[PDB]
Amino acid sequence: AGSIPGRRS
Amino acid sequence: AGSIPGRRS
Amino acid sequence: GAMGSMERASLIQKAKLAEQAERYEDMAAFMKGAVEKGEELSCEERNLLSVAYKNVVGGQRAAWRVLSSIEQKSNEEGSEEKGPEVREYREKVETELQGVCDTVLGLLDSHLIKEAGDAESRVFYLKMKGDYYRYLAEVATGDDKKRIIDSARSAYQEAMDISKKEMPPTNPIRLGLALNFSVFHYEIANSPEEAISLAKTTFDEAMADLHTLSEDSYKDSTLIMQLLRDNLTLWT
Amino acid sequence: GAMGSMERASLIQKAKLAEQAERYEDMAAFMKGAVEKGEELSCEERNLLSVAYKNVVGGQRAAWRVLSSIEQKSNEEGSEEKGPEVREYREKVETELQGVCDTVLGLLDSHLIKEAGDAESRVFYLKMKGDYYRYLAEVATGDDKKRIIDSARSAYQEAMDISKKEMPPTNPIRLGLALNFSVFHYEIANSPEEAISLAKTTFDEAMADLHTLSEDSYKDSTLIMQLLRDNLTLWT
Ligand SMILES: Cc1ccc([N+](=O)O)c(OC(=O)C2CCC2)c1
Ligand SMILES: Cc1ccc([N+](=O)O)c(OC(=O)C2CCC2)c1
Ligand SMILES: [Cl-]
Ligand SMILES: [Cl-]
């Protein structure tokens, strides 16, 4: 189950 | 041009 | 104020360079320095702060999961005693992860949230607060696991209440908040039915609002909607 | 002796765990602590030392190249002035990289090389010495670029002389040394013809010795031979 990746601006 | 990757034991 | 002698604008410029160089620890330190200048953050600056710490804690969480899995295999029937090293090293990584989460939570509490008056900024920071309590909850085991879980829930809930009043159902921050709160329900709170209901209702209300969007906004919103769908497919 | 209170065997165990967790800075610190116990390193332990620092410096080199490229674009005709930040940050990364290279070179000099009597260990450490001087040469610009280049060349040459006398032409350490020395010739020493000649002769002499190998050794040697071939294809 994935949260927002959020690792690239 | 590649040297030995050498990043995994 | 370890970054106290650097200009705010230079810290932001260096955070962007650190992102390009994939130096996320540096990026987080630059953005922490920028927050500590005391001024509010713009939309782009909030994204830089979030990207930096998400990469730092993401690496720590991945390492913690590797070590926790090795440790659990060592504490099984038929396992040769390996000494204290696996536990000691998992504990070291866990403490480092907790320290990063505490640092982020401290920035939010001093004083990003209290100065955030617009819905976009307040929801963003409260989502961050829920996320970093959720990361603390992933490793918690003692007298405060329940309190950590409730702190995550409370932050997500306040963000949800604001987002439902102040943002359209396709707003990417509202969508990502709902996505992450649904993950909280499924993975932390042992509430898979609540996770599924939230993901379904969020997806359906966004679908009905897509007609109002430009092509670029449509792409932004549908990308996050697909993540909701991906989770629903895994959960049902 | 920051790791001075931990058992040698525990440092090695933790280095292996750090590798699995992709925590290469930790891995390097554990292996540095193990070296500083003062005992010689086994074949497996040498590999752990090399893997740890190769990952650390590899990340630094990748970041330095990103920042150096941005800096060179900023110092071009028609480029808006961006202030000192790109140069300052490239310099910070460069200094950190130099510090890691100096740390590795210091371990080799105190006292890994002097205690290394067998061909496998001595060639391994001298190859490492050439590699870390080569990484220093990649960023060098001042009064000592020539001396840094000569230090890399001298270390590689001593390793080559030993390997040709003491190891078969298919030995993976001999093959990787020749590969990296050829890269030194091409990328550092402005000697592409020497790079090509070394790669060709190394490949051909290994090919003629493959018949002596077991299936597992054949796989080890041919993997590195393919890297020589890959470079020859790019260079010719
Ligand atoms: C919580 C959240 C929700 C939606 C996002 N979104 O992509 O719109 C988002 O941002 C990202 O995914 C990364 C790009 C900047 C950070 C973050
Ligand atoms: C200099 C060199 C040459 C050949 C190697 N080789 O693969 O045999 C080598 O080792 C590796 O590539 C990594 C696996 C352990 C480190 C290193
Ligand atoms: Cl430890
Ligand atoms: Cl800097």
The CATH number for D235's domain is 1.20.190.20
Residue type, D122: R
Q: Compute CA distances D64 → C13, C22, C211, D154, whole Å.
A: 16, 11, 46, 25
Provide the shortest C-alpha distance from residue C47 to chain A (in Å). Answer: 6
Is residue C10 within 8 Å of residue D83, measured between CB atoms? yes
Is residue D94 within 8 Å of residue C54, measured between CB atoms? no
Q: How far is the CA of C177 from the centre of ligand 2 (A)?
A: 45
Kindly tell me the burial class for residue C47, based on how many C-beta atoms sit within 10 Å of its own C-beta (0-12, 13-18, 19 or more).
middle
The technique is: X-ray
Write the DSSP symbol of residue C40.
P
Contacting residues for D59 by C-beta, under 8 A, at least 6 apart: C22, D24
Kindly tell me the burial class for residue D146, based on how many C-beta atoms sit within 10 Å of its own C-beta (0-12, 13-18, 19 or more).
exposed
Write the DSSP symbol of residue B8.
-
Can you give chain C as a three-state secondary structure string?
CCCCCCCHHHHHHHHHHHHHCCCHHHHHHHHHHHHCCCCCCCHHHHHHHHHHHHHHHHHHHHHHHHHHHHHHHHCCCCCCCCCCHHHHHHHHHHHHHHHHHHHHHHHHHHHHHHHCCCHHHHHHHHHHHHHHHHHHHHHCCCCCHHHHHHHHHHHHHHHHHHHHHHCCCCCHHHHHHHHHHHHHHHHHCCCHHHHHHHHHHHHHHHHCCHHHCCHHHHHHHHHHHHHHHHHHHHHC
Q: Do A6 and C176 touch (CB under 8 A)?
A: yes
Residue type, C132: Y
Closest D-chain CA to C14: D85
Closest D-chain CA to C11: D85
Is residue C127 within 8 Å of residue C177, measured between CB atoms? yes
Look at residue D105 and tell me if it is in a domain: yes
Q: Do C50 and A2 touch (CB under 8 A)?
A: no
Kindly tell me the burial class for residue B7, based on how many C-beta atoms sit within 10 Å of its own C-beta (0-12, 13-18, 19 or more).
middle
Among candidates C84, C128, C74, which has minimal Cα distance to C103?
C128
**C-alpha span between D232 and D193 (Å, rounded):** 11
Is residue D230 within 8 Å of residue D203, measured between CB atoms? no
Torsion sign across C-alpha atoms C196, C200, C201, C202: positive
Q: How far is the CA of C89 from the centre of ligand 3 (A)?
A: 4
Q: Residue D168 in 3-state DSSP?
A: coil
**C-alpha span between D57 and B1 (Å, rounded):** 17
Q: Which residues of C touch D74 (CB under 8 A)?
A: none
The CA-to-CA distance between both ends of chain A, in Å, stands at 22
Among candidates D216, D112, D54, D204, which has minimal Cα distance to B3?
D54
Torsion sign across C-alpha atoms C18, C19, C22, C27: positive
**C-alpha span between C84 and C95 (Å, rounded):** 16
Q: How far is the CA of D152 from the centre of ligand 4 (A)?
A: 29
Closest D-chain CA to C16: D86
Is residue C26 within 8 Å of residue C18, measured between CB atoms? yes
Here the tokens at position D81 are 């002035």
Nearest CB to D66; choose among C20, C62, C85: C20
The count of domains in chain C is 1
Look at residue C199 and tell me if it is in a domain: yes
**C-alpha span between C228 and A3 (Å, rounded):** 9
C81 Cβ under 8 Å from any chain D Cβ = no
Q: How far is the CA of D211 from the centre of ligand 2 (A)?
A: 21
What is the gyration radius of the CA atoms in chain D, in angstroms?
Answer: 19
Domain limits for position C114: 8-236
Look at residue C235 and tell me if it is in a domain: yes
Contacting residues for C186 by C-beta, under 8 A, at least 6 apart: A1, C192, C195, C196, C231, C235
Torsion sign across C-alpha atoms C95, C98, C104, C107: negative
Among candidates C125, C13, A3, C179, which has minimal Cα distance to D85?
C13
**C-alpha span between C231 and C195 (Å, rounded):** 9
Look at residue D2 and tell me if it is in a domain: no
**C-alpha span between C105 and C125 (Å, rounded):** 10
Look at residue C1 and tell me if it is in a domain: no
Nearest CB to D187; choose among B1, B5, B7: B1
D187 Cβ under 8 Å from any chain B Cβ = yes
Which of C57, C131, C135, C173 to mutate to test ligand 1, by most ligand atoms within 8 A of the CB atom?
A: C173
**C-alpha span between C52 and C47 (Å, rounded):** 8
Write the DSSP symbol of residue D6.
S
The closest ligand to the CA of D170 turns out to be: 2
Is residue D134 within 8 Å of residue D184, measured between CB atoms? yes
Write the DSSP symbol of residue D220.
H
Look at residue D1 and tell me if it is in a domain: no
**C-alpha span between D107 and D101 (Å, rounded):** 10
